[PDB]
Design a protein around this nucleic acid. Sequence first.
RNA 1: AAUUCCUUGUCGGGUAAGUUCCGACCUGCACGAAUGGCGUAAUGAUGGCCAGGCUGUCUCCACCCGAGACUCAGUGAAAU
RNA 2: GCUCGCCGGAAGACCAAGGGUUCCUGUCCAACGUUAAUCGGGGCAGGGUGAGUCGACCCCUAAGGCGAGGCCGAAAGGCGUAGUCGAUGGGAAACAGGUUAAUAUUCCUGUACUUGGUGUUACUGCGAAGGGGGGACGGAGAAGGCUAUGUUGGCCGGGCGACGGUUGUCCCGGUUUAAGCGUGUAGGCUGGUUUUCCAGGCAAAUCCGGAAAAUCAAGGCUGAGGCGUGAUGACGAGGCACUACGGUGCUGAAGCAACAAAUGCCCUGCUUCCAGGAAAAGCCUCUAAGCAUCAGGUAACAUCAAAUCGUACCCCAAACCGACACAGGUGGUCAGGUAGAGAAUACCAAGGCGCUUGAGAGAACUCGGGUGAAGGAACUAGGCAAAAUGGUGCCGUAACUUCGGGAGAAGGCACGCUGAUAUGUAGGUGAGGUCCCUCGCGGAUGGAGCUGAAAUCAGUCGAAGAUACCAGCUGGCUGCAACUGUUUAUUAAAAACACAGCACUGUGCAAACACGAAAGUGGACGUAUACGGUGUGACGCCUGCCCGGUGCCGGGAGGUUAAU
RNA 3: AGGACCGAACCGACUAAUGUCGAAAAAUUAGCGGAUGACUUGUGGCUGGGGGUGAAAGGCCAAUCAAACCGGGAGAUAGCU
Lengths: 17, 13, 46, 271
Amino acid sequence: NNRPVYIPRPRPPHPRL
Amino acid sequence: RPVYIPRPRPPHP
Amino acid sequence: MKRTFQPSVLKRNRSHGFRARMATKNGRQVLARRRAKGRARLTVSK
Amino acid sequence: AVVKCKPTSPGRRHVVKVVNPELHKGKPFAPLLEKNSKSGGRNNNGRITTRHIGGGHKQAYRIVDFKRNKDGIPAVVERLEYDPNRSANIALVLYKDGERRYILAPKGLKAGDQIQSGVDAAIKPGNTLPMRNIPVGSTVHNVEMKPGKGGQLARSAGTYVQIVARDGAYVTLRLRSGEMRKVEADCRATLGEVGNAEHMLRVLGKAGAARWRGVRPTVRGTAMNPVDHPHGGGEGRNFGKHPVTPWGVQTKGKKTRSNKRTDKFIVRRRS
RNA sequence: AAUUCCUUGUCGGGUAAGUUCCGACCUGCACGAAUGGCGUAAUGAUGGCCAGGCUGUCUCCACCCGAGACUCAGUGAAAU
RNA sequence: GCUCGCCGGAAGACCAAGGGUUCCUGUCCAACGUUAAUCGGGGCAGGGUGAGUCGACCCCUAAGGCGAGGCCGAAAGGCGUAGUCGAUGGGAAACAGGUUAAUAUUCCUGUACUUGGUGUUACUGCGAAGGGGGGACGGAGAAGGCUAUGUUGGCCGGGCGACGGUUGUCCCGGUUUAAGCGUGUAGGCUGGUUUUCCAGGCAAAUCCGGAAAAUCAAGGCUGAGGCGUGAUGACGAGGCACUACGGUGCUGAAGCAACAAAUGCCCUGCUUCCAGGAAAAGCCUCUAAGCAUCAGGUAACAUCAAAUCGUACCCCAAACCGACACAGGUGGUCAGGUAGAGAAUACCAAGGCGCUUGAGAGAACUCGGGUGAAGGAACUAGGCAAAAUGGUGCCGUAACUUCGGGAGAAGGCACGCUGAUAUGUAGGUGAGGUCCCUCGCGGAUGGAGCUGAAAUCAGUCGAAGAUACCAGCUGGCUGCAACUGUUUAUUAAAAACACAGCACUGUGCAAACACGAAAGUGGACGUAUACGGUGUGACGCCUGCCCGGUGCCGGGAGGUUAAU
RNA sequence: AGGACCGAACCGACUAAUGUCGAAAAAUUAGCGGAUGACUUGUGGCUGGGGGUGAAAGGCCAAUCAAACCGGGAGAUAGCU
């Protein structure tokens, strides 16, 4: 109903390069 | 509604 | 964890108070815009 | 006197102190004092105009009489005092009429010495006379650019100028930089050399010493990023550029004097 | 070598066994003298190696004390 | 209500900031409270904030803001003088006790104090944005005198006691009193008095400063605490009479001494050090203009005035900042007992709390801990994590070194209790008496009493005496950086950055340079033993050859070369 | 005397574990560094976005930074989904 005002910032655990 | 009188009341320590 | 907002009445009034807005023409336009929008609170009033 | 302190701890190993036993151990003369608010290198716009300035001990301002307009009044040197605003010590002098004043202290002064101003003055150090009356070849300090201006040359500790020639109404002086300048003969000058000649022998020892002297750390251009300084950038200490100022001007040997107004008064330049 | 591809260069020390470490040689791919070279006591929540003590780190786990997990009563979510 | 547990340099009592009725009483349990709820910082209603002395307000000013004219700028506008604002600073004055369900240094009782107006009396020159003094100032360090406060003894009141003993050197409680006024001390500072003169203090001056003499050797200023009065008052353990049984009323003994002792006061002091440590007003003082029969000022008395605003409650938190009744953050003041060097740590007092889901069971497994046979790093990228060391005194202590260090190197020895030396020593404090007194807060003799380490000998208990909490692991070789320090708030604390030192280079003061269309400002109220830029990075040995190329500096023979 | 030593308050964040729809949009527990200084902190000011500030990491500038936030040009443009 209400857009979360905060969006958590994730991380890249797995480079997958 | 709005109070506008935050005058200081310092009790002697 | 100290947060961004640390209230202080003196700093709030001297920064965004009514007289602060009237000092400069840009502040006067800010008041003019908010009068046009019809906002109940023109500024941060003590 | 130069004293080497023992290395009881790091920060004292390289300290060399200059101690003057005859300096006054007490408060200065209050009537001649004035407040000196620091600026931190900021101008009226609030922006940093001079870098590496800020902090330091609070210091008051002593009204030093550079003009020396008390003509014909004998004066006696009460005492010598430490001036935080100057490299050279100042001297508190009492005139015969009951007036006290501050003057730069040449090498020869001591408590009780007699000094005199005006043209009708002796040749001993500390007396101020128009440069026309000063014999050629003598050493003077606190020389005036223009009559009554006050005195601007040879003001640091252990500085002086040489009078080399006198043509017409103008006099030629050799400054401590090796430059010859032509000055009006009406300008006043003080005989002798500025005292505290050992002020250059101090080393300050540690980082804090320069810190509470009002000097802030200096960051090299190479250590910075390309967006901040013309130097900087690259991996592993790459320079590959001609040295320049932070604003692009080429330093390290580029002449920046562009006056065209006072050049008529310059006889030789630095070598 | 904070620099060395070939390379775990060669020899010695240390270990029963040392691609690490320490010492020496120079065949320096591609060190080098204020973008400084070589030493340097003291200092370092700095990198590497060795020794004594110490131990559940481990051979190899065992028991025990508390908080959850489990059951009952009340309240009552979330990603998908 | 009775027990148990927790905090006790706080999880107690106060504020400032910030909240804005959350404060108290009555009443209700829908929602809110991570459960129930009769309860609540929830709902509804009522009540509650009392000042000449507290603070704000007000007088003065710092950084800084605004800024009449003015300078500058296409406009907007920028800067700034005179001025005027701006507390985080300076400036007059109240303490104790009692009382409300909720306010009190504000109300009541008692005893005080400050600044102004008016009036009366006796003297007198008064008079400024002007002069001078004062206000008025750093860091560190040490001793002395003190007090807050604590402990013990004495005194007063009560007790002698459900498990042995306890009328005794035994146990419990109390033993408190302010501001103001008078005295003037420990300590600190300074030589006073009279006369004459002086282009100095943008005018003047009896004031400040300076120069002369005569005179005495003292005077003056500041100053904690103590002592009297305040106070034959208040308070006071406890006892007695009624309780809407929460509490109300009445009564009320002793109220001393010694020792220890602050981070608080004397002290914005004193002694030292280089980095040399606000301003203005209030206040004192001297005069110009002006008036000196006035006005005004001083001294005493009387009277009047001191307005307005804040005053509840939380304030390390459930009430502030974090969306929450959130394991976070938030400046200042008070801060007791035993052991301890200590505001560490353990256990406690005053006081406040058990953190708003509980009851069972006693699986795996996870989290936080305890112990462990034999071995002791065999684990692992790596002794990661754990374990271990840990205090005091004495002995002893290597390489290397800048001679300071390294170093608490490493490594050994003894730590409890009781008695004796000594019916508690050395030491500290110091009553009464005696003699002097430039006579009171005075100086000697004296030691009563109180307090009290450290050490030796002997004895004695335990497996263990730095017995708990608290409390370094150590040594050897080596790379990098000299060192303390700084840095990617929220995966990098380092060899990175800085650094003192060193060198090059620019800059003659309307300085170079920087911010600004400009004015102007910083640099600097400094001026080459100074300032800016650049590289290197303590210290010791040093730092070689190369000017082709690109920069920078100088030259001018000749050639080419814009506007015009 | 000391950018001296040990160590609380105070400031910081080297290691480990827990916690990752947490008590918490970086914390807790046990250790750890500085702790008279280049220290730390309260209150109030000044510097404004191609700008500030920076003991220099492209760090920080209201939980957002190799160019902050808000409104406008604006229904930018998108041979792409």
